[PDB]
Amino acid sequence: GSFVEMVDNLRGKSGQGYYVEMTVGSPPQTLNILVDTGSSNFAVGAAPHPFLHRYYQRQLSSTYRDLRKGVYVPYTQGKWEGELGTDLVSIPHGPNVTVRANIAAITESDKFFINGSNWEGILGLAYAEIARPDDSLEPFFDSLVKQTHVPNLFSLQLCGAGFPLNQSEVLASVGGSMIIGGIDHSLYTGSLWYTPIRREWYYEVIIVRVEINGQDLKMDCKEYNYDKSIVDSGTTNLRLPKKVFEAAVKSIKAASSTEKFPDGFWLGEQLVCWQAGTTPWNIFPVISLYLMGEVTNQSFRITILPQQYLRPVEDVATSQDDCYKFAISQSSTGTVMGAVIMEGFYVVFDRARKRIGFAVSACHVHDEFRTAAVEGPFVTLDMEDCGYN
Amino acid sequence: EPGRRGSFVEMVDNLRGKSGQGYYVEMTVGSPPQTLNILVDTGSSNFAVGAAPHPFLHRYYQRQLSSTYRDLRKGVYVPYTQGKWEGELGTDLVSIPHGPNVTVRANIAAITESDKFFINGSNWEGILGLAYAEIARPDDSLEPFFDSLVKQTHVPNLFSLQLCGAGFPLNQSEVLASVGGSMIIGGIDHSLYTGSLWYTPIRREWYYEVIIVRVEINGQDLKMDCKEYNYDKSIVDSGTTNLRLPKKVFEAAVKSIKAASSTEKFPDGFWLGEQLVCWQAGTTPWNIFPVISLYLMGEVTNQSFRITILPQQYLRPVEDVATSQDDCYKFAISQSSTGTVMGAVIMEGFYVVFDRARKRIGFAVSACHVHDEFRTAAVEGPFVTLDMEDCGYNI
Ligand SMILES: Nc1ncccc1CCc1cccc(Cl)c1
Numbered sequence: 001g002s003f004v005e006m007v008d009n010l011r012g013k014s015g016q017g018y019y020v021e022m023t024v025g026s027p028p029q030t031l032n033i034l035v036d037t038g039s040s041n042f043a044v045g046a047a048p049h050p051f052l053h054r055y056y057q058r059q060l061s062s063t064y065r066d067l068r069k070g071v072y073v074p075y076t077q078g079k080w081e082g083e084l085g086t087d088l089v090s091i092p093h094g095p096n097v098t099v100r101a102n103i104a105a106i107t108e109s110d111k112f113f114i115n116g117s118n119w120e121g122i123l124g125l126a127y128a129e130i131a132r133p134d135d136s137l138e139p140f141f142d143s144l145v146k147q148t149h150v151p152n153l154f155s156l157q158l159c160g161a162g163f164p165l166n167q168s169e170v171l172a173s174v175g176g177s178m179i180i181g182g183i184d185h186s187l188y189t190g191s192l193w194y195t196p197i198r199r200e201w202y203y204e205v206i207i208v209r210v211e212i213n214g215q216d217l218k219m220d221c222k223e224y225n226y227d228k229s230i231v232d233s234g235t236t237n238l239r240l241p242k243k244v245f246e247a248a249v250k251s252i253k254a255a256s257s258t259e260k261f262p263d264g265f266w267l268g269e270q271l272v273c274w275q276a277g278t279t280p281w282n283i284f285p286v287i288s289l290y291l292m293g294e295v296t297n298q299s300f301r302i303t304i305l306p307q308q309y310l311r312p313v314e315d316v317a318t319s320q321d322d323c324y325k326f327a328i329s330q331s332s333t334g335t336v337m338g339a340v341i342m343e344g345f346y347v348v349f350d351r352a353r354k355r356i357g358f359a360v361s362a363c364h365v366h367d368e369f370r371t372a373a374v375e376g377p378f379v380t381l382d383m384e385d386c387g388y389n
Numbered sequence: 390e391p392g393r394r395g396s397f398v399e400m401v402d403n404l405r406g407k408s409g410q411g412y413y414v415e416m417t418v419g420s421p422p423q424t425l426n427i428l429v430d431t432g433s434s435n436f437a438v439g440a441a442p443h444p445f446l447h448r449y450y451q452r453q454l455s456s457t458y459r460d461l462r463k464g465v466y467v468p469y470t471q472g473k474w475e476g477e478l479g480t481d482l483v484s485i486p487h488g489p490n491v492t493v494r495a496n497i498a499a500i501t502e503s504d505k506f507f508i509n510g511s512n513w514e515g516i517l518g519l520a521y522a523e524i525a526r527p528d529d530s531l532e533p534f535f536d537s538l539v540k541q542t543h544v545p546n547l548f549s550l551q552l553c554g555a556g557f558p559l560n561q562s563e564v565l566a567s568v569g570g571s572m573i574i575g576g577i578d579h580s581l582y583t584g585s586l587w588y589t590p591i592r593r594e595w596y597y598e599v600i601i602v603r604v605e606i607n608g609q610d611l612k613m614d615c616k617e618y619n620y621d622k623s624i625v626d627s628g629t630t631n632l633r634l635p636k637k638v639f640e641a642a643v644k645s646i647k648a649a650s651s652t653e654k655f656p657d658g659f660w661l662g663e664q665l666v667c668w669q670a671g672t673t674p675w676n677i678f679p680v681i682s683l684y685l686m687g688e689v690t691n692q693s694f695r696i697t698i699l700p701q702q703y704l705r706p707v708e709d710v711a712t713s714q715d716d717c718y719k720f721a722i723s724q725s726s727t728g729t730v731m732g733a734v735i736m737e738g739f740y741v742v743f744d745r746a747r748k749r750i751g752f753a754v755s756a757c758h759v760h761d762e763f764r765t766a767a768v769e770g771p772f773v774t775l776d777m778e779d780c781g782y783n784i
């Protein structure tokens with residue numbers, strides 16, 4: 001399986017998001033759209049905004065259809081307001097098809113757009129159950145599969161550079177691949193291991209065990225999925241439930257105790273720098289998340305390195321030091337496997353078989369001593385009890 | 390209890406006008422004195438008067454007729470988004486007939502050219518900028534009138550304003566005969582307010598800048614980062630008609646106000662503050678509109694207070710295009726790209742004390758605020774509020 005036309009069709013970074021080019025309307029209006037497996041709405045800027053240098057102009061599209069309905073999407077971290085309608089949509093570097101899908105024309109927003117991100121909209125790839133205003137608004141991917149012969153599946157390879165990318169660099173660099181309707185074998189190494197999609201709303205999965213450098217965090221596995229665990233490319237960090245986060249930071253601190261870092265670092269707020277090339281990767285532990293497998297009483301694990309959970313950021317002085325921010329934070333809405341984590345793997349969203357596959361990414365950052373991994377199987381009992389109800 | 394006395398009778402009721410065209414006070418300039426009506430503006434710092442013929446002016450400052458006129462041989466250009474005026478700087482003897490019994494020599498910008506500055510039928514021929522020197526044009530070396538007044542006399546460094554909206558439209562004849570409020574120069578008149586005065590600090594001395602720490606619509610917290618409320622600043626400006634809010638705050642507020650008043654549907658033009666809405670005489674549904682509360686930083690650490698206005702304040706009375714017997718209004722809240730602006734609309738609900746001496750602004754329920762039998766404007770406190778300093782904006 002190889003989809004050369006879709007390989008390397010993404011750009012961006014964990015801190016500002018990964019996006020793919022799309023066109024909307026007739027004549028085609030090109031827009032960069034954030035790939036988000038954590039939401040289910042296709043929404044684009046449709047009015048001037050200081051952070052946008054282009055937006056969807058409905059009056060210029062002959063195929064625009066007004067649904068005469070508004071949609072308000074408030075989140076704890078931000079919000080966007082829009083007007084619903086439909087239009088013809090295509091993905092230049094994707095399947096050779098055009099479909100009529102729902103589009104939320106964003107007219108008002110609060111902390112939605114990111115200065116310098118280079119994207120003007122968002123592509124919610126999750127299910128209708130969480131679509132705004134309600135599940136009657138068919139998500140883009142659903143329209144795509146229903147209107148074409150494209151297989152009900154997509155895979156994502158998000159590629160973190162391992163170092164800071166400046167304004168021009170991030171615009172020229174290849175940030176990864178989104179293969180629509182298939183799996184490209186050149187994007188990963190080793191085997192793919194699948195965990196079931198527990199329920200079709202967010203891409204929900206179940207974590208059954210957590211290790212820090214092989215040491216079991218030893219918590220009731222229900223804590224790991226309280227109140228849910230999801231794969232969300234729309235979130236930067238690996239976010240863990242309060243109690244799990246507190247235990248993990250204690251363990252990570254213990255493992256890296258040869259060097260002390262200020263509280264602000266562990267709060268993911270302030271950066272830490274080291275002289276060029278001297279980042280002490282080896283003092284930081286690897287983190288393993290065991291996921292439910294498709295076989296009864298069987299599980300597998302994905303292991304990430306500090307190269308994944310330490311996010312490269314530019315120093316205020318733009319010096320030659322190598323700096324990073326701690327990309328693991330506290331959550332009140334369950335575990336969130338954000339961009340940070342996805343960068344270590346090729347992730348297959350097998351909608352058709354209700355499962356998510358993980359394989360070591362061909363573009364994950366590592367060193368000569370350790371590598372990310374996807375290994376199995378392991379015998380694990382009562383994994384169903386790890387899920388929250 | 391104890392009844393509060395009014396000690397500045399000579400200045401009480403010395404204002405005229407309305408929110409839409411501004412409130413003004415009578416002043417005299419030159420020798421012999423030339424009488425002119427001057428717009429009271431806490432949003433600027435220049436004393437400028439028409440000094441040449443203009444279609445909307447019935448009179449103007451005639452420098453050649455004043456024996457005390459002094460030419461500063463300097464020009465001044467004051468452009469704004471909504472208008473501009475140009476003039477020639479100089480000084481002369483100035484007085485306020487219904488104010489302190491003193492005469493001082495102050496700077497006067499003789500307006501020779503203007504665009505969209507003078508308003509037809511406002512009845513004022515000049516402006517009195519009461520803010521600080523930092524925002525004076527051309528620069529802070531041009532001492533503002535109030536500074537001159539305080540430096541040259543024994544008048545206390547403080548003034549208070551009671552702007553009185555009528556609650557209904559006033560035609561040309563009526564607005565000329567009606568008392569529009571009071572400007573007490575050098576003191577506080579207790580007959581102009583009820584309840585207690587609560588003070589918020591003047592954050593910085595340029596505009597009369599304050600800090601809003603919380604906003605509620607009918608008791609419901611707008612729940613925005615308080616920094617948003619003061620982006621990029623929050624000021625008290627009698628020279629502005631509406632309550633203006635930062636874009637994001639306006640969007641959130643209008644949505645909440647719409648939700649609270651949802652039993653009635655209004656056209657987009659209304660919410661944009663552009664078109665009026667009318668109801669049969671006496672049937673304005675005040676009760677369906679929410680009260681709005683703005684919490685301000687108090688003078689005591691971690692303490693705040695709130696001022697609450699009614700729709701009687703934020704819905705501005707306007708005459709129907711058909712001069713019918715309907716009661717009509719325009720929505721007097723609009724967005725801003727220059728921070729929050731507590732304009733005349735809001736000031737009409739309170740007696741506002743500009744305590745320059747103690748770098749603070751006091752608020753109290755106005756004795757002339759419009760209300761109904763069920764609700765009244767209010768100034769209440771104290772409330773425990775933490776990290777209020779973080780609400781202030783810094784470039
Ligand atoms: N992908 C997500 N994950 C968690 C919560 C919300 C989203 C949607 C994307 C998003 C993120 C922050 C602010 C806004 Cl306005 C929208």
Ligand SMILES: Nc1ncccc1CCc1cccc(Cl)c1
Nearest residue numbers: 430432433469471472473506628
């Ligand atoms: N007080 C103010 N507040 C905001 C902006 C400008 C002013 C000055 C008064 C004013 C009002 C309208 C037009 C002009 Cl030309 C000047």
